Symmetry: C4
Amino acid sequence: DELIKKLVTELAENSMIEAEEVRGTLGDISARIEAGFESLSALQVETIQTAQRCDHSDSIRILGENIKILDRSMKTMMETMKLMMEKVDLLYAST
Amino acid sequence: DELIKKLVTELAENSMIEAEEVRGTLGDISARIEAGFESLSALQVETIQTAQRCDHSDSIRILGENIKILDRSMKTMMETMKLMMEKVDLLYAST
Amino acid sequence: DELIKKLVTELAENSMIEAEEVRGTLGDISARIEAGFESLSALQVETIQTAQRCDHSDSIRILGENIKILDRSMKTMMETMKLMMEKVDLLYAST
Amino acid sequence: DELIKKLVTELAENSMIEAEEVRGTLGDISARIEAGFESLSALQVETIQTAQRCDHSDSIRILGENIKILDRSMKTMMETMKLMMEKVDLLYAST
């Protein structure tokens, strides 16, 4: 195995160059994977944080509650109007 | 083919190591693909679930409906005011 | 080049198997890329379509416009009240 | 090393073809990575821009403020009604 091992090395010497170029190419691809995923997920988090600003559950409830306060104040006023009119009716009949 | 097959094995013995290292590298890349896609999609689902909380179609409709109830109560009161005034006008002329 | 070409084939015969297994592995990776991107983008479109349901620009404007109608009706009523009172003042002084 | 180098070239000649086909396949994969990431991120930006249209913080505040103006106008009217009634009471007792 004297001449055999000399040919084993001279063949590895030429393949090792093509193995290095594939390894670098694979690492270039791996770097583009971890860069796309790191970028999109940061943009994705920015989407969730933005969406949260549009949840107006409490704001709309407070508007709703204050419309019902006004409705109750309108009932209170309708009772005060009929009360005033029932005094006016008495004033007319007192002539 | 006695010596031929001895050189075929001694060459496979040295290439098999470089094939294993490429296979492991490919599997490292494949694992990063299924990890990025599993993570981003989970973050993406969290975005849809968050966006749904901002659909206030029904809340805003109930506010709108109760503003129109108040508007109708305001028409009812305007008729009651003119009614009261038309009794006051009669009371003035009765002097 | 008689014996040379016989060794060229017996070496290609053993490498061709390792080339096929890498080609299949590469295609397995390529298929996972086009599957993740096809899935996430479909989920992403579902996010945009969901977000559109939360744009209540017109609904909120119609609420705003009808609150200002009520405000104008309240001004109309305040003028009718002072009008009624200015008739009541005259009725008191007519005694 | 006369015959040795002739076999080194005739072996590189057959491997160089399989190296080119792997290089093209790797580049086909790399192109699908930069295409998916470029597409999804453009769709992701469209999601953020859409979500911003649903932030009605200011619109809802102006509705809230104008409901409280109406509430204050309703208090002003309740004072004017009791004022009118306190003149009507005096008119009844003046008989």
